[PDB]
Amino acid sequence: SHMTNFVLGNAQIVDWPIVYSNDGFCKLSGYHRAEVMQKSSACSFMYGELTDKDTVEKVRQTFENYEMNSFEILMYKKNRTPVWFFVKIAPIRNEQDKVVLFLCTFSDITAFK
């Protein structure tokens, strides 16, 4: 399922703001739900020096183009600890086939990277 840690982003507003974050994501990221809500579901609030900038660009284009893609990406927990995440980005469509949300699912792959 990989539903341990996830957020939902609003596909129909610029920057795809997070409209839901589960307890797992808050724990994994180090950020309280209050701090995550309305941030970009691209999670650029977690990017930093070591984050691969080509990967950041591919992640942006995935949202921009309403695509389904997944990435390994070096991000930073709230306390500045660097962590390798596996991130899956998946558009969610309504019954009229319009993309309304993005489901973004995350796991820590630091141990295996």
Author numbering: 25 to 137
Paper text:
The KCNH family of voltage gated potassium channels includes the EAG (ether-a-go-go) channels, the ERG (eag related gene) channels and the ELK (eag like K+) channels; these channels have roles in cardiac repolarization, neuronal excitability, cell differentiation and tumor growth. A defining characteristic of KCNH channels is their large N- and C-terminal cytoplasmic regions. The N-terminus typically includes a Per-Arnt-Sim (PAS) domain, while the C-terminal region includes a domain that strongly resembles cyclic nucleotide binding domains, but which has been shown to have little affinity for cyclic nucleotides. As already stated, the role of PAS domains in KCNH channels is unknown; it is not known if these domains bind small ligands or mediate interactions between the channel and other proteins.
Crystals of mEAG PAS domain were obtained by removing the first 26 residues of the domain, which correspond to the disordered region detected in the hERG PAS structure. The asymmetric unit cell of mEAG PAS domain crystals contains four copies which, excluding the N- and C-termini, are very similar to each other (rmsd for main-chain atoms of residues 28 to132 varying between 0.2 and 0.6 Å). In contrast to dELK, all four structures in the asymmetric unit of the mEAG PAS domain show cavities that overlap with the one detected in hERG. The high resolution mEAG domain structures reveal multiple conformations for some side-chains, in particular in residues surrounding the cavity (S65, T86, I97, F109 and V111). Strikingly, the volume of the cavity in the mEAG PAS domain varies among the different models generated, from a minimum of ∼111 Å3 to a maximum of ∼136 Å3; the largest cavity has as maximum dimensions ∼8 6.5 6 Å. Only the conformers of V111 have any effect on the cavity properties, the remainder of the variation comes from adjustments in main-chain atoms. Unlike in hERG, the cavity in mEAG is isolated from the bulk solvent by a lid formed by a tyrosine side-chain (Y71); this residue occupies the same position as H70 in hERG (at the mouth of the cavity) but its larger side-chain occludes the opening. The residues that line the cavity defined in each conformer model vary but, in general, the polar face is determined by main-chain carbonyl groups from residues S65 and A66, as well as by the hydroxyl of the side-chain from Y71 and thiol groups from C67 and C128. The apolar face is formed by side-chains of apolar residues: V83, F87, I97, M99, V111, I113, and F130.
